[PDB]
Design a binder for this molecule. Structure first.
Ligand code: 8I5
Ligand code: CL
Ligand code: CL
Lengths: 267, 261
């Protein structure tokens, strides 16, 4: 066994974020495992407070939220059960829809922050605070939620960064944007979703690339590990966690080239 | 100055290796750095710390297992069925990834190797026969397996620069866990029976992909984060030492609370 630490302070997390390369005004997408950072004096919100302190109010912080309770599976239910879901399941409400189960404690904290913004796409919904929170989350199209009209696309375009805080590299949502952009020999295209329109629940059909299964013989772990191996990003400790800092545009470029050279029209 | 035998012994003991322990090793020889006398000195140092009363195991598998023959042209499959050699524990090579040390261990005097081709384990030391004996061909990571026995004798898993995703013991956790759905595989394999090649059908849980929305890295990272195991440097490698019983219990709970029915 390994015993818990004396709790990390706000100031010592700011120092570590800066030592890693976080700079004022950057736009960051964070993937974190809170337990991996270790005990923090004041709890997990201090992680976010420290990171925004390193970024200043001129910086921007975004996290993937999705929607834990999306009823995207109801076509597989028998007719009577499906009818029950159609009538009784709540719509996606950006104010109260809970983020996906894993590695999302900080996303849920971010939702109680004043001036938080949440994008409109339920399954692909992102949350953000800071200078470009509105810009990044605006007009997130319902179809192809990781594509050209996504917060991921905008993060790449404003040359933001991805910060890994003890989360496995294959949870980098940006890699779904690489899948979207890459010209590949086989893609799976897929579902119902209740949303709010003028304050009333309406069911819509969302069209997207499948993001549950890969489009071919690969895994996100493979791409990311290949990226780190070739020098991508910077590394450093943040609390007890091993942290990685990646340029969004570079990683996206690398991943699209990775996918196209194996399964693309250049293979 | 390459790492000396003594330097590695002291690092193993600093990490928590002790005389008499039964240990499964997962290593990346590259990660350790140059060792004076080569990679075998890693194993000699570890066995020195364990003493002859200790036991050292690694996953070997079978690099050349022809479990893919049904996906070949029929004409080629027919050639495989006539000409591909059976699994022979004496000479079957281990799988290529992170296995330099497993191949070294296969030349140790008194090494034992378990009979399940795909799931084959090699071991030396006091309990090497116990661990490798009567390894069932079906469900090779299940109840009749070296992993089950490693847990029963309160052994350990030592990660020596190898990735946390490569912990074979977690396939035993997958076997044990009551989950909503587990994928079963059935595949052909030639083995030796009374000195003769016989092709058989092996049944197992899939070990190539997880049975649900998880990764082994994620489980082991959660384990470490909640205080599981010890950590430290061995040579140039990041090392982790886990108790096999506690890690299995943690991983089964982890799987059941997330993907149970
Ligand atoms: C309309 N959506 C479904 C389309 C359907 N055709 C897909 O099969 C289905 O995906 C299954 O569920 C994944 C769990 O992640 C399994 O894939 C995992 O298993 C292996 C695969 N190699 C791992 O290696 C890999 O990492 C994967 N994690 C798939 O079997 C989709 O729903 C999921 O994905 C949605 C994201 N849009 C979530 O919103 C849902 O809650 C739901 N989890
Ligand atoms: Cl978390
Ligand atoms: Cl190796």
């Amino acid at each position: 066994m390994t015993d818990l630490n004396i709790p990390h302070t706000h100031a010592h997390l700011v120092d570590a974020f800066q030592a890693l390369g976080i700079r004022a005004g950057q736009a960051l997408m964070l993937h974190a495992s809170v337990k991996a950072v270790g005990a923090v004096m004041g709890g997990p919100n201090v992680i976010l407070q420290a990171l925004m302190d390193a970024l200043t109010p001129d910086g921007t912080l975004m996290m993937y939220a999705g929607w834990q309770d999306i009823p995207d599976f109801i076509d597989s239910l028998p007719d009577a059960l499906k009818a029950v879901y159609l009538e009784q399941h709540p719509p996606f409400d950006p104010a109260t829809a809970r983020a996906v189960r894993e590695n999302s404690v900080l996303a849920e904290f971010l939702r109680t922050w004043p001036c938080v913004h949440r994008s409109a796409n339920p399954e692909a919904s992102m949350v953000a605070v800071g200078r470009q929170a509105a810009l990044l989350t605006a007009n997130h199209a319902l179809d192809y939620g990781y594509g050209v009209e996504s917060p991921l696309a905008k993060l790449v375009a404003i040359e933001g960064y991805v910060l890994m805080l003890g989360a496995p590299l294959d949870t980098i949502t940006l890699l779904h944007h690489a899948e979207y952009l890459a010209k590949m020999r086989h893609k799976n295209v897929v579902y119902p979703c209740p949303i709010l329109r003028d304050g009333r629940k309406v069911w819509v059909t969302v069209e997207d690339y499948d993001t549950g299964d890969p489009h071919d013989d690969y895994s996100f772990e493979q791409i990311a590990r290949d990226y780190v191996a070739q020098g991508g990003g910077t590394r450093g400790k943040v609390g007890d966690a091993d942290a990685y800092l990646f340029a969004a545009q570079d990683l996206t470029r690398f991943a699209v080239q990775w996918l196209e050279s194996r399964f693309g029209d250049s293979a």
